Design a protein around this ligand. Structure first.
Ligand SMILES: Cc1cnc(Nc2ccc(N3CCC(N(C)CCO)CC3)c(F)c2)nc1-c1cnn(C(C)C)c1
Length: 275
């Protein structure tokens, strides 16, 4: 279960944005660490909105499944603060924030090798999940966090972690699901409870498209009704200008769930690009 953290030991600081029915804040946790040394630890405080408290179970189950595993590419959960009025997840703070914002800001400093490294790390995380037969259900660049920037003078590649899925698509309003096209696969638009390992393979492809597109959002110009018809007409996303992963993207975003490649196969395909 989750380590229960006291309101008294948490300081809330600046807002870092929003998720679905959530707000995130940078914060500080007072704790006793190794050797009994006192620390003031930077943390991410994720707060379920007051007006959506009926989603509290899905909110914590999302973080819970994530926290019964340990892996270098998965965001750490420190605990929960059930205390009082609010429902709060206390997670590790990641310096450089979401990948989608980072891509947009640094679009012109990010080359093919950077993208390949991040894609490989994300595939490793998803491979780990697949081996444990655990569904994430919300893979997207917004839910990928950058721990460390690239350093091309000390050899260091960038390093990412995948954050928790948030409130499951199985219990979310239809309108939110439709807006999440094309991350949510077609079979889940027809029936959200078609949530399957195959689900994350589709969303992985959509996330690769993001990575290759400098933080653009695919189909952003389409409203929810046009997004629905995009799936009905069985369209594929356009290749990004940097089209090196275009085939991989389309192979993952296969309208037939059973034909989507394993993350083993995906990683093998990723390792094949270079010279
Ligand atoms: C789990 C987690 C851990 N650490 C962090 N850290 C973290 C650091 C920095 C930012 N910035 C926000 C503002 C940016 N600019 C300057 C103004 C407007 O864009 C600058 C970057 C950040 F959003 C997040 N976030 C998370 C986490 C958990 N869920 N989510 C989703 C809901 C987004 C993120």
């Amino acid at each position: 279960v989750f380590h229960k953290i006291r309101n008294e030991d948490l300081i809330f600081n600046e807002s870092l944005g929003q998720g679905t029915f959530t707000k995130i804040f940078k914060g500080v946790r007072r704790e006793v660490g190794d050797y009994g040394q006192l620390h003031e630890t930077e943390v991410l405080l994720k707060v379920l909105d007051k007006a959506h408290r009926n989603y509290s179970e899905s909110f914590f189950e999302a973080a819970s499944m994530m926290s019964k595993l340990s892996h270098k590419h998965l965001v750490l959960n420190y605990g929960v603060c059930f205390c009082g009025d609010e429902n709060i997840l206390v997670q590790e703070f990641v310096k450089f924030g979401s990948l989608d914002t980072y891509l947009k800001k640094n679009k012109n400093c990010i080359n093919i090798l950077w993208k390949l490294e991040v894609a490989k790390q994300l595939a490793w995380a998803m491979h780990f999940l697949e081996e444990n037969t655990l569904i994430h259900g919300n893979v997207c660049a917004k839910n990928i966090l950058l721990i460390r920037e690239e350093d091309r003078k000390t050899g260091n590649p960038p390093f990412i972690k995948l954050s928790d899925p948030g409130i499951s698509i199985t219990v979310l309003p239809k309108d939110i699901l439709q807006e999440r096209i094309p991350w949510v696969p077609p079979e889940c638009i027809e029936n959200p409870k078609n949530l399957n390992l195959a689900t994350d393979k589709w969303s992985f492809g959509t996330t690769l498209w993001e990575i290759c597109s400098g933080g653009d959002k695919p189909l952003s110009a389409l409203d929810s009704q046009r997004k629905l018809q995009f799936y009905e007409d069985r369209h594929q996303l356009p290749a990004p200008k940097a089209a090196e992963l275009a085939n991989l993207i389309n192979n993952c975003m296969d309208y037939e769930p059973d034909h989507r490649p394993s993350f083993r196969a995906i990683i093998r395909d990723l390792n094949s690009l270079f010279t």
